[PDB]
């Protein structure tokens, strides 16, 4: 049942609200009609797809225009264990897909830190995960997709076909080449739903960097770390590192061998439920605390399910991103591998800034792909979460400048406030991408708040 409703929209960050007509229909034919209507007009304030709204900024909103909610197009058409291909509507989310694919011994090839994202959102942001250095980003695994363009046609795009240019502009394109209706993804084969993991705890930034540079990364398909962004040096940049690979059946204890592909139910009680007063005791911040933390986060060959290995912060319940009525600003950047001193300088700047981030992701990215607006490049990728308070806006503008100067970039899926000038300098293939977009949407049928702010329109 199709509905068109005026709706106040924000990204996950709950900032920059704007009002748009939100179309919500399970009918593909209706979506086509709306795009044909906008194009007949043709353009006006245009249209943009929206997935599950997990992007923090303004890429899935369109103030004074049309937003098409893609979540009702969520049919899994087929899964094939022999070809390893899945054929699914763009509104299918990655949790749904993971659960449907497991009985075939198939693994979603790129998983982000939350499972509530659409296939369309995964493609449009060319999302990355803990296995980026071994598997690339989501775009690398798309074998085809059906794109509804401004001319009202549906184009079958393939990575190396005749429409490869448009394919690779849609990857990481933030919905600005049209509406992805449907895609075919090549999955990763697996015999189990478990990981075998090694954990390490480092004492400092220099140590965290050495561990990622000593060659050991090549022995793990999956690798990420939490780091300390608050402590003065030398504690600054100390990390709990979690690295592993998917387990094989024989690597499971006998207990788990009868259902190797099973996903366990996320249990009832989290840590806030069990320890409401917190985890701190008289030992926590001294030498016995340091030792305990070091020992508990150091291990070899530990069998873990998805939550344990991949969503380790789920146990922290209501404690993560808590207490702030003002909200938080999520800031994610990557710095080229070779710029290691520069990378260390930026971590120092953050620590000395007087803005405190507790939730810190650290990962070494691998080789980039051919998508001109793709975020990942090989090098040091960082996510930080700053509580909103005075001076933050002007400080993150300074961070932008250092990120840019050091050859790095910000991620559109996280950004709500960088400038067009900074963004364009961070993405030297932006003009190349813009030319593809104007060729495929001369009338700006597709438009968003981000497109206008970053002058991608």
Ligand X SMILES: Cc1cc2nc3c(=O)[nH]c(=O)nc-3n(C[C@H](O)[C@H](O)[C@H](O)COP(=O)(O)OP(=O)(O)OC[C@H]3O[C@@H](n4cnc5c(N)ncnc54)[C@H](O)[C@@H]3O)c2cc1C
User: Could you tell me if residue 447 is left (phi over 0), alpha (psi between -120 and 50 degrees) or otherwise beta?
Assistant: beta
Count of chain residues binding ligand 36C (CB under 6 A):
13
Q: x/- string (CB under 6 A) for ligand 36C, residues 381-420?
A: x-x-------------------------------------
Asked if residue 23 binds ligand X (CB under 6 A), the reply is no
Q: Site map for ligand X, 78-107, x if CB under 6 A? A: ------------x-----------------
Supply φ then ψ for residue 351, to 5 degrees.
-65, -35
> Per-residue DSSP letters for 24-70?
E-S-HHHHHHHHHHHHHHT-TT-EEEE-S--SSSSTT--TTSEEEE-
Query: 57 among the known binding-site residues?
Result: yes
Query: Which part of the chain contacts ligand X (CB under 6 A), choosing from 14-22, 95-103, 110-118, 211-219?
Result: 110-118
Q: Does 320 bind ligand 36C (CB under 6 A)?
A: yes
Q: Does 444 bind ligand 36C (CB under 6 A)?
A: no
Task: Tell me which stretch binds ligand 36C (CB under 6 A): 85-93, 262-270, 292-300, 313-321.
Answer: 313-321
CA distance 20 to 222: 40
Binder of ligand 36C out of 45, 128, 155, 437 (CB under 6 A): 128
* Residue 71 structure tokens: 């979540």
Q: Provide, rounded to whole angstroms, the least separation between the CB of residue 416 and ligand 36C.
A: 13
Contacts of 192 (CB under 8 A, 6+ apart): 246, 247, 248, 249, 251, 252, 260, 261
Q: CA–CA separation, 43 vs 62, rounded Å?
A: 12
Residue 149 interacts with ligand X (CB under 6 A): yes or no = no
Window 90 to 119, contacts with ligand 36C (CB under 6 A): 113
Kind of pairing between the strands at 299-304 and 195-201: antiparallel
- 114 to 143: interface string for ligand X, x by CB under 6 A: x--xx-xx--xx-xxx--------------
The verdict on 330 binding ligand 36C (CB under 6 A) reads yes
Q: Does 271 sit near ligand 36C (CB under 6 A)?
A: no
Strand order in the sheet with 409-410: 299-304, 195-201, 239-246, 222-227, 361-365, 379-387, 328-336, 409-410
Q: In whole angstroms, how far apart are CA 334 and each of 50, 315, 404, 426, 450?
A: 26, 27, 10, 11, 20
State how far the Cα of 451 lies from the Cα of 266, in Å rounded to an integer. Answer: 38
- Residue 188 has φ and ψ, to the nearest 5°, of -100, 130
The residue at minimum Cβ distance from ligand 36C is 113
Counts of helices then strands in the chain (DSSP H, E): 15, 19
Among 16, 19, 36, 313, binds ligand 36C (CB under 6 A): 313
Instruction: Report the interface residues with ligand X, using CB under 6 A.
Output: 12, 48-55, 59-60, 70, 90, 112-114, 117-118, 120-121, 124-125, 127-129, 174-175, 179-180, 413
Known binding positions for FAD? 49-59, 113, 118-121, 125-128, 180, 411
Instruction: Report the interface residues with ligand 36C, using CB under 6 A.
Output: 113, 128-130, 224, 313, 320-321, 330, 361, 363, 381, 383
């Amino acid at each position: 049942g199709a509905t068109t409703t005026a709706t106040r929209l924000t990204g996950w960050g709950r900032t920059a609200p704007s009002v748009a007509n939100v179309l919500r229909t399970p009918d593909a034919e209706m979506i086509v009609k709306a795009v044909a209507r906008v194009a007949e007009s043709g353009g006006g304030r245009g249209a943009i797809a929206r997935g599950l709204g997990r992007s923090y900024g303004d890429n899935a909103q369109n103030g004074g225009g049309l937003v098409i909610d893609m979540t009702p197009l969520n049919t899994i058409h087929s899964i094939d264990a022999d070809t390893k291909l899945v054929d699914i509507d763009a509104g299918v989310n990655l949790d749904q897909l993971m659960k449907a694919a497991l009985p075939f011994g198939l693994w979603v090839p790129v998983l982000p830190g939350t499972r509530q994202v659409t296939v369309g959102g995964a493609i449009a942001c060319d999302i990355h995960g803990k296995n980026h250095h071994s598997a690339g980003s989501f775009g690398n695994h798309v074998r085809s997709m059906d794109l509804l363009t401004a001319d009202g046609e549906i184009r079958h795009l393939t990575p190396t076909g005749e429409d490869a240019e448009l394919f690779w502009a849609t990857v990481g394109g933030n919905g600005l080449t049209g509406i992805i209706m449907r895609a075919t993804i090549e999955m990763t084969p697996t015999s189990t739903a478990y990981f075998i993991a090694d954990g390490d705890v480092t004492a400092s930034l220099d140590e965290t960097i050495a561990l990622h540079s000593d060659g050991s990364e090549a022995r793990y398909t999956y690798s990420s770390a939490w780091f300390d962004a608050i402590s003065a040096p030398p504690k600054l940049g100390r990390a709990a590192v979690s690295r592993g690979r998917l387990a094989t059946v024989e690597q499971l204890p006998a207990k788990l061998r009868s259902e190797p592909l099973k996903f366990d139910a996320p249990q009832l009680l989290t840590l806030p439920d069990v320890f409401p007063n917190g985890l701190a005791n008289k030992y926590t911040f001294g030498p016995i605390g340091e030792l305990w933390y070091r020992k508990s986060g150091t291990y070899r060959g530990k069998v873990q399910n998805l939550t344990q290995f991949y969503h380790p912060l789920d146990m922290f319940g209501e404690w993560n991103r808590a207490y702030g009525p003002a909200g938080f600003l999520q800031y994610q950047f990557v710095i080229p591998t070779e710029a290691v001193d520069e990378f260390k300088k930026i971590i120092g700047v953050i620590q000395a800034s007087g803005h405190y981030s507790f939730l810190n992701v650290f990962k070494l990215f691998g080789p980039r792909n051919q998508a001109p607006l793709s975020f990942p490049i090989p090098g040091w990728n960082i996510c930080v979460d700053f509580p909103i308070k005075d001076g933050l806006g002007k400080f993150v503008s300074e961070l932008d400048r250092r990120v840019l100067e050091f050859g790095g970039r910000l991620y559109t899926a996280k950004d709500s406030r960088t400038t067009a000038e900074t963004f364009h300098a961070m993405y030297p293939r932006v003009d190349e991408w813009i030319s593809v977009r104007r060729k495929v949407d001369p009338l700006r049928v597709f438009a968003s708040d981000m497109a206008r702010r970053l002058e991608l329109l």
